[PDB]
Symmetry: D2
Subunit: 249 residues, 4 copies
């Protein structure tokens, strides 16, 4: 029987590439999404056309609130309901925008940035562990977490907290055979929202090829960590950044 994975924020960009690559490796997948319903459904259709009954969708807002724990339990339950098992969890969903220290209320900014990047991953990890082979969790971290973008305090706080969870959960879940690791992009998939000077600016900074990573290149590191070639790896965060984090100001 085929193992099953949950991928959060899987309708597009990097999460989509991760879902596709896991599916290509033999996994049945739960495609979690928030607003991108059309793309999520379209992906499930593509994957199921490829192998019957190997993809479902699960919608949820991963903003922090009093109902988040239940939402996270529901996402995990989705995988068990469809597939009878949940082997892999990939915490990819993430809000990202500036929150200057000096439009949304600040409390809403806290809820979204800290929720998606950290609390939800924790609650998902909890539900995943409680519901239990090669079991593992992969968290999408930031290679430049110690050289933060100006004015992105809350995002960066969420991403540091995710490092904490990766390490703490690796330690605590190791007794149950559940590995917990991170994959930490530098820049990958520059937005269409972004100008040509701005994109070029980022690309010129990347030592290895002066270009951003493709989504597939991020997904390759996820595949490695969930594989049997990573059986002794837990609590490790693998940068997939082309050397970007090594470049001083």
């Amino acid at each position: 029987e085929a193992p099953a994975a949950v991928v959060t924020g899987a309708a597009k960009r990097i999460g989509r590439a991760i879902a596709v690559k896991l599916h290509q490796t033999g996994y049945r997948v739960v495609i979690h999404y928030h607003n991108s319903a059309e793309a999520a459904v379209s992906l499930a259709d593509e994957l199921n056309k490829e192998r019957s009954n190997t993809a479902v969708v699960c919608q949820a807002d991963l903003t922090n609130s009093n109902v988040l724990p239940a939402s996270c339990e529901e996402i995990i339950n989705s995988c068990f309901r469809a597939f009878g098992r949940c082997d892999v969890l990939v915490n990819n969903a993430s809000a990202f925008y500036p929150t200057p220290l000096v439009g949304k209320t600040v409390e809403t900014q806290v809820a979204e940035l800290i929720g998606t990047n950290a609390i939800a991953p924790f609650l998902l990890t909890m539900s995943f562990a409680q519901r239990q082979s090669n079991l593992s969790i992969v968290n999408l971290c930031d290679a430049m977490v110690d050289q933060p973008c100006m004015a992105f305090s809350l995002y960066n706080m969420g991403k540091h907290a995710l490092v904490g969870l990766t390490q703490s959960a690796a330690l605590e879940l190791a007794p149950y055979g559940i590995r917990v690791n991170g994959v930490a992009p530098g820049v990958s998939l520059l937005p269409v929202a972004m100008g040509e000077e701005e994109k070029d600016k980022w690309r010129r900074k990347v030592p290895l090829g002066r270009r951003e990573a493709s989504a597939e290149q991020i997904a390759d590191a996820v595949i490695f960590l969930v594989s049997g070639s990573a059986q002794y790896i837990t609590g490790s965060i693998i940068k997939v950044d082309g050397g970007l984090s090594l470049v001083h100001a």
Copy 2:
């Protein structure tokens, strides 16, 4: 005119040691507290006996909620109200208890552990900056053992990791405003009030430098250094005060 400082969770233990040391150094202090009203007012009294109108208490819950930003703005406002200025913010208040992955609800555990150790610091830092020859700084109480977490303390550890991020992010963003943001990271310092002595000494024997926990004063000494003119170029630095504990393998 004397500068003024806000210390969170300053009614007892390390926070009090910090408020006391700042006060001795010439600061006027806002003693924030949550449940320890008697301890806070008593400290405020001691300090005002030393110098009149140099201490005030300020009560606030720093659990995450949708009014936390208001609460944090009020704390800073209380320093301006009392003293006409606010030079130093120390983020010391902290909830600490296990939250196993496998009867406070989890919502409450998330709110208290992430609110006190990270979100309140952020919102206080926001309010401190917004409300502004001077020496403005923020000191965050971090964990020296943040990368070797205690078993079953994931939310507390997430909170402290987030506080590293805030220290770095805020150092970067507030530097152009003349506001320095640093950390002090104890290893083991004042042991929990309810801990016994088979266990207190088990923590003590782990510490390379002296086989003993740090005194509150020793933690405060590092805080006083970072707020001082002797640290005028230091920002985004987290100073470990751990007797080498973080260097010891399993």
Copy 3:
């Protein structure tokens, strides 16, 4: 045409396992050794018996000296002489013994521990780059480098230097398309000879399975890093440590 790899300290233990796995993967290999002449020649014999003309040995002392640069240049030259190309360098060879602060002279301890663990990797890197495809270098680091063993200051200084080399070379060699990464064991392959009681003491410290890594598990991470699935990864150090580095005192 088959790519080629130099593995230092490859006659036994972890370097041998890395050489065996690269070879099983399709590489021709230079098996470098210092003293284990017999284990080394036996390994080339066996690999060549499996695929003709795919392994050679190369003897060099990697202690620091004024001749170390020529010795490192010759190692890389030996790979080109045998195979016509040099695609991969694995800096595995390492002296390891205590050097307390309070039979070998200190001169000799410095030369052996700092030479093998840091200066030879640097010179081999230089010769690798100067002599020049998915080109990459993998350095064998320590997962515990920031929680050092008591009385192992020079060994630890070496392994820290190795971290700096991994990062500096990743940055500098990126424009040439050469990736530089690290694999960081916690405990792996305990000396057959170390006492059993001491062995079980190390084993009981590892969160994931309460056992040391196999040599093959370490090699798996090397294989990942030199592969086409790691083409945007440079300057990354992957712990393969079962969470050991995460455990407080």
Copy 4:
């Protein structure tokens, strides 16, 4: 009576500021130097004029060689000869120049850069410990050690090794009551001869004040670490960098 301190490389710039500030705090000092004999002699004169026979000079090359251990033992011996005690060691002396991976020979660059930045500090640390209250060692590290300057591998390796020494020696010397810490400048006291327009290119990068640290600001962290206000501080590296290491590419 008054404590005593060795400062390596103390004839000018940051080492000189450290020596002066220690002396002003009440220490007697050994002013170590290599080439700068006029400045070292002149400094000791100035300090002895303040307080009689509270300063001596000591010349030594700290390049790695077979005689480096005796050289370092003689530096510590010189403190004992002059003042009968040695309470503080400041490892400040450092060679700094590029060593590209692609007329000094490379073995000489290894010897100078690894010798001054790491091996001499180790040797001085050994001698200091052997010859033994508030005893401590302060090592001059880099805030930018994980974002290395392009083509400065050997220097960066040296500074990484020095982090490792700081930590290893803190652990090992703690039972002797000797604390071991570091001070990590970002950019400080730029060379007088560097054009001001090149100086401004570094300055512009520093978040706190768009300027470099004074030598005195660096010395202030050293004075803190050696003081009774840092009596529980060991194995800590304090960045004094105006936020520079936080700024991304």
